């Protein structure tokens with residue numbers, strides 16, 4: 001009798017059972033940071049991990065039985081699938097980072113609690129309207145990063161030797177973080193006019209962000 | 220004597236006298252900071268402090284007789300109690316710290332001047348809307364602080380050794396405080412891809428902030 | 439005698455004469471910056487400044503014969519008065535800083551050109567709305583300067599050694615300037631809990647400002 | 658007959674064709690940034706460029722036939738002209754700052770795509786309303802830059818030795834970047850009241866900026 005399992009997943013106790021579970025693995029993962037805790041009580045913490053990872057895998061499968069193909073247009077579930085799946089690749093071999101990846105699963109507190117999903121809606125939703133302004137700027141970064149690599153990358157490789165470096169550096173300058181005493185004044189000992197580059201650049205990059213914040217605000 | 224006391228506390232001179240005294244204690248507390256000045260007046264001051272702390276103690280008692288239970292449903296009045304109270308623990312016995320905490324009674328000039336109560340009130344009133352966006356931020360901070368301890372706490376313990384440290388650093392980075400030349404460039408000498416953590420983090424953190432302001436303005 | 443002079447001061451020639459003299463002086467003052475120029479043309483422009491100072495003085499006297507009381511209840515005319523008067527104080531010997539206040543006379547470009555006054559006035563108009571907030575800030579900064587000088591002033595005399603210094607260092611923290619790697623991290627080497635003064639202070643100091651601006655928008 | 662060419666220029670293939678060319682050269686110019694790529698494909702890109710600068714040149718000529726005297730009244734076309742003109746001067750052997758200036762041609766992506774031109778058009782559009790404020794700021798900066806040179810250039814020539822420098826530092830202090838520990842605290846070692854120049858300065862420049870944004874928002 002299909003509808004019988006299908007009704008369990010939708011219950012208020014199931015989700016909250018899961019919500020109460022994630023909060024537990026999350027607090028677990030916190031204590032997992034304490035080096036003292038991890039070998040004074042480490043086995044319980046390894047155990048909770050396999051249980052919860054199994055239980056969550058069960059929970060996702062049930063919702064798959066229930067939702068069938070309509071599960072794969074729920075971003076939240078797609079997220080849940082990929083985030084639980086992540087926590088399931090075997091540690092042995094491969095990437096130790098995937099082992100760190102597991103904690104992303106703590107974002108399920110977001111996935112399972114309606115206000116957070118609703119908070120994100122305010123967050124995600126101004127983004128599509130910005131992609132155009134994000135397009136102009138990105139282009140600018142791409143153009144200026146290039147000019148910065150050719151003008152300063154020979155003598156200042158750490159900062160500008162490569163395209164990526166001009167980007168990472170320019171972002172920094174864009175965040176305005178220790179940009180003068182830290183990047184331009186040194187440049188200017190070798191290339192006295194480097195300010196004719198950065199000062200306009202900062203302007204454009206500063207100006208755009210400001211007006212971008214404005215168009216967001218009126219709405 | 221109920222009405223007789225009631226007419227005292229409510230007079231325009233008692234509060235003005237008490238307010239005047241606050242302005243007086245505040246002038247002395249500033250004065251107390253000079254170690255020269257202390258030698259000449261140290262005792263001289265020491266008593267004005269104990270006089271003012273008593274006069275105020277009288278005040279709190281008088282105001283309580285009039286209101287009984289209605290005194291302790293006034294958030295502004297509770298604060299006055301708690302602020303004068305902790306100034307009652309003796310100059311030792313627990314921590315020389317309480318001795319520094321007592322300066323909080325100058326927040327009484329706020330307490331006693333109505334124009335200020337509205338500004339503070341206007342200020343406090345923005346907060347409840349934020350508590351949803353605030354909570355969400357705390358989760359992201361909690362998740363990333365964990366990944367950060369595991370990723371960077373071994374080679375860079377000052378910055379990421381513990382959740383606390385991972386937190387503190389992240390807050391700093393959140394403030395974009397010397398974040399670039401000062402933290403992420405050093406991380407990258409060891410973990411070249413560390414920019415994949417902070418650059419996305421900085422994005423989320425500055426973005427959510429915008430909308431925290433956006434939602435404030437619009438609402 | 440009245441109108442003929444009166445027919446002078448409201449005339450487009452008079453003000454414009456005074457305007458072109460500001461701009462010329464604004465240009466002459468740039469030249470005075472180079473030791474090189476001053477070396478071989480210094481006596482040339484030391485005199486030009488003098489004519490203009492006289493001309494501005496004649497100008498202030500005239501507007502007074504014409505206006506009298508009306509003159510000294512006009513803020514833009516009062517500034518001019520004061521910004522001309524200060525420029526009347528002797529350069530070479532005795533007091534040296536007033537010699538530097540002279541270039542303040544380039545602010546006469548603001549008073550004499552109508553689009554500037556309106557923008558300055560629009561700008562000033564914002565101020566009354568925020569004075570309650572501003573008073574609050576100074577009480578708040580003060581309260582904190584006291585706690586700071588006594589908490590940290592001993593091991594970090596430079597940063598908190600004096601009431602005035604703690605105001606200063608705290609003001610820096612509000613600009614978020616090099617605040618963490620630069621101040622709090624160091625403070626924490628000795629006083630691990632110093633983040634309990636500065637992280638809340640930061641949140642609050644950030645909070646109020648944001649609201650002051652939001653207050654401007656709403657106003 | 659002149660009519661026959663005119664129908665080619667105006668086609669939907671044409672403008673789309675040029676855009677597509679821009680994106681190739683834009684991808685291609687990222688490739689000129691890698692010396693590695695240059696030891697294999699450099700010969701392809703040194704000429705792929707040259708025919709693009711040829712094709713764009715042919716195209717600019719064409720658009721001049723079709724639009725006549727009205728072409729040099731089109732802001733976007735005028736740019737195309739100059740940004741293409743720059744790209745034609747061969748290789749080295751003059752001022753080779755110009756070889757990198759070639760990349761400004763990737764901004765034709767902006768001129769030729771209508772959403773980008775709007776944002777940009779929208780963005781520039783805020784400028785005319787700022788020009789009164791920019792004028793004021795620059796008069797403020799220029800004034801404070803003069804003063805800094807007379808007060809601080811002797812002992813701190815790197816920073817205030819000359820007007821330009823004084824300008825630069827003041828710009829830096831305005832972006833609030835490592836201003837205290839980086840500039841003013843060192844100043845104060847020799848000239849103790851420098852905080853009185855810089856903190857009011859810091860306020861004003863901060864005051865205007867906040868207030869201009871509010872003006873953007875309401876209008």
Ligand SMILES: CCOC(=O)C1=C(COCCN(C)C)NC(C)=C(C(=O)OC)[C@H]1c1ccccc1Br
Nearest residue numbers: 361364381382383384385386387388390633634637
């Ligand atoms: C939210 C969890 O973060 C923490 O554990 C910390 C608290 C408790 O969290 C409070 C978070 N909030 C007040 C900022 N005090 C704050 C303030 C820290 C921090 O770096 O946050 C900016 C760290 C910390 C904890 C234990 C021992 C040392 C440290 Br150092």
Ligand SMILES: [Ca+2]
Nearest residue numbers: 178397616835
């Ligand atoms: Ca810095």
Ligand SMILES: [Ca+2]
Nearest residue numbers: 615616834835
């Ligand atoms: Ca900084």
